[PDB]
């Protein structure tokens, strides 16, 4: 009926993106000195989980980190003293995401229960209790994060995104249009835009105030598993099961650089930039994390200290350490 | 050495570690199973294990006790057809009970294809699958009627022979026994194409109304446990 119009629009967009491709990212910055072999060592070894660790998130102080495993218990780990600060027993053992509020007052966690419950840490009752519950989603929550001190972003299993208000606990903003199941979402430093990747080999940019999609980049060939935003606020890297990471710029509106290798055939499970954004870390299904250069696309470092599939990776706000959590219930801090 | 705040933090960490150690006992003592099946696969009747509140809830849990051992069965609720991402979460489960109803042959072969994704999965290649051939009375009535033919959907049934290891119940027609053994073989030809040492299958013949299914579930769990113990000790 109108499929020809959509095909013509796609062809026009492709021709416009091809005409603006003056040079590649690997050609403009090629005379830069190599980063060299970045050898990292383990500084702290966090253990104590009873099931496979699934997700983790660093706070805004580089001292506390929240972790969500498949046992229904949250532990606020301390990277400095290697001790436990809080133990939150959850009502469900099947969780898939976690977050840490910037002020350090609330912690959200969701999963197969379609509810990202938020718990308070500074309660006067002496023990952590249920602070708020957000129900209404028709699918498992893959990414539940804090957008501000009063809003919370969630990616539901029905190919939709929802920005809830903590005060009223109702659907404040909706985002529909995705064809595949959203797996990960990364917020921008200015809390104005956010990119989301779904199971359709494409990522979409959405606004926190407009409520619409403006930039969609396919780029990949398989389901996108992880995503991360560049610290500059204009680019973002994505990873899929095709063992190829791809960088996309919001201003350039085109793919920047592709990281791949013939020896790697396993997909990416977690990805995160550094403080400067030159080193890009990505863990694979072969119990190791590869750190590549954002300007040379060469293998800068390899970190192999896990025995099972890596599930989560997190870089601190200052970049002084990187936490990695696999299904072996072992959190490892590398520097 | 340690200050007051450091001592308080160490004491809190020790208390949390003791609580985790105490919870580990009841975590390892209780087993966890995953109930899977299609819409008309009779999952609503097998999940009724109460004999021992969210409208949009996509996961339900049923707790019961068999031979003093506590079991928790998790059943997926309202979920889309895309089942390639969340299925990786059920990697440490004890067993996967997949309900199969042999009442509509047109929907059987497709289902067999779910068994071959449950079996040829890269991450779920070490988890055993408990096969329950539910609703055998419907298949028996359909075979005794003569309207629907099995050869119209499966040509191998036209040349299949009853094996010597067959043990039918006294009073049952040999035709329904041959049919159920052909179905079991068709399932085994798929369940034996991969693994052979990592995980096995447990076929059974149920009718959605039985008071001894808990015993079979407990026996299968014990078999999986002893197989894991033999594999870990290298004895296997």
């Amino acid at each position: 009926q109108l499929r020809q119009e959509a095909e013509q629009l796609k062809n026009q967009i492709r021709d416009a993106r091809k005409a603006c491709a003056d040079a590649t990212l690997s050609q403009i910055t090629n005379n830069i000195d190599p980063v060299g072999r970045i050898q990292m060592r383990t500084r702290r070894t966090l253990r104590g989980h009873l099931a496979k660790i699934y997700a983790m998130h660093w706070g805004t102080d580089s001292r506390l980190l929240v972790s969500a495993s498949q046992d229904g218990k949250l532990i606020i780990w301390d990277s400095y003293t290697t001790n436990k600060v809080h133990a939150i027993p959850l009502r469900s053992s099947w969780v898939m995401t976690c977050a840490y509020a910037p002020s350090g007052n609330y912690v959200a966690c969701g999963g197969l229960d379609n509810i990202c419950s938020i718990y308070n840490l500074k309660t006067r009752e002496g023990n952590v209790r249920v602070s708020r519950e957000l129900a209404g989603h028709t699918g498992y929550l893959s990414c539940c994060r804090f957008l501000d001190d009063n809003q919370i972003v969630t990616s539901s299993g029905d190919t939709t995104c929802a920005l809830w208000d903590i005060e009223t606990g109702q659907q404040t903003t909706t985002f529909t249009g995705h064809t595949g199941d959203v797996m990960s979402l990364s917020l921008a430093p200015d809390t104005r835009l956010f990119v989301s990747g779904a199971c359709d080999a494409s990522a979409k940019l959405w606004d926190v105030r407009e409520g619409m999609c403006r930039q969609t980049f396919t780029g990949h060939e398989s389901d996108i598993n992880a995503i991360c935003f560049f610290p500059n606020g204009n680019a973002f890297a994505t990873g899929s099961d095709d063992a190829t990471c791809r960088l996309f710029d919001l201003r350039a509106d085109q793919e920047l650089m592709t990281y791949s290798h013939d020896n790697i055939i396993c997909g990416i499970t977690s990805v995160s930039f550094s403080k400067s954004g030159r080193l890009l870390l990505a863990g694979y299904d072969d119990f190791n994390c590869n750190v590549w250069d954002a300007l040379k696309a060469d293998r800068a470092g390899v970190l192999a200290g896990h025995d099972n599939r890596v599930s989560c990776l997190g870089v601190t706000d200052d970049g002084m350490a990187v936490a990695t959590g696999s299904w072996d219930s072992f959190l490892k801090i590398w520097n | 050495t340690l200050s007051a705040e450091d001592k308080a933090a160490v004491e809190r960490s020790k208390m949390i570690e003791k609580q985790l150690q105490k919870d580990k006992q009841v975590y390892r003592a209780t087993h966890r199973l995953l109930l899977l099946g299609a819409d008309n696969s009779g999952k609503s009747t097998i999940v009724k294990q109460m004999r021992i509140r969210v409208k949009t809830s996509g996961i339900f849990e049923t707790k019961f006790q068999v031979d003093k051992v506590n079991f928790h069965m998790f059943d997926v609720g309202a979920q889309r057809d895309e089942r390639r991402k969340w299925i990786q979460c059920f990697n440490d489960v004890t067993a996967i009970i997949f309900v199969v109803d042999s009442s509509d042959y047109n929907r059987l072969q497709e289902a067999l294809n779910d068994f071959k994704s449950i079996w040829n999965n890269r991450w779920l290649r070490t988890i055993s699958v408990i096969l329950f051939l539910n609703k055998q009375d419907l298949l028996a009535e359909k075979v005794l009627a003569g309207k629907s033919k099995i050869e119209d959907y499966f040509p191998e049934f036209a040349r299949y022979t009853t094996p010597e290891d067959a043990t039918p119940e006294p009073g049952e027609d040999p035709r329904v026994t041959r049919a159920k053994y052909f179905i079991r073989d068709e399932f085994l030809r798929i369940s034996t194409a991969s693994g052979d040492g990592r995980h096995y299958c447990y076929p059974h013949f149920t009718c959605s109304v039985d008071t001894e299914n808990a015993r079979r579930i407990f026996n299968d769990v014990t078999d999986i446990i002893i197989k894991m113990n033999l594999r870990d000790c290298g004895l296997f």
Partner: nanobody
Amino acid sequence: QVQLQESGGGLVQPGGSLRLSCAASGFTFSNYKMNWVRQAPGKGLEWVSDISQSGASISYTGSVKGRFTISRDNAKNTLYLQMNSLKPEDTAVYYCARCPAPFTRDCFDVTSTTYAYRGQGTQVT
């Protein structure tokens, strides 16, 4: 961009033969398992054929074994499906899907309602 285009449909008579051709672009055609399914009016999706990357692992359903055949060309990245002895009940919409994860044997969501890596299919009467 991943795009699969199928062709070969037409007003065929019961008992003839049809050579359907599917061409994929935007990904490594030789590193993903392929599947062909059918959908009848008023019914659901039914798995018909499955072929691996190299082609040594080919599987069919009950009413296809010995009747239809499938071939794969990696030099041109094409998937051909030759259907002989067409029955009056073969009038359906055929779809071609790819494996979501590379270098994997399992194939999930082959009969899913919403699949972003599947073509529009072709009608066969």
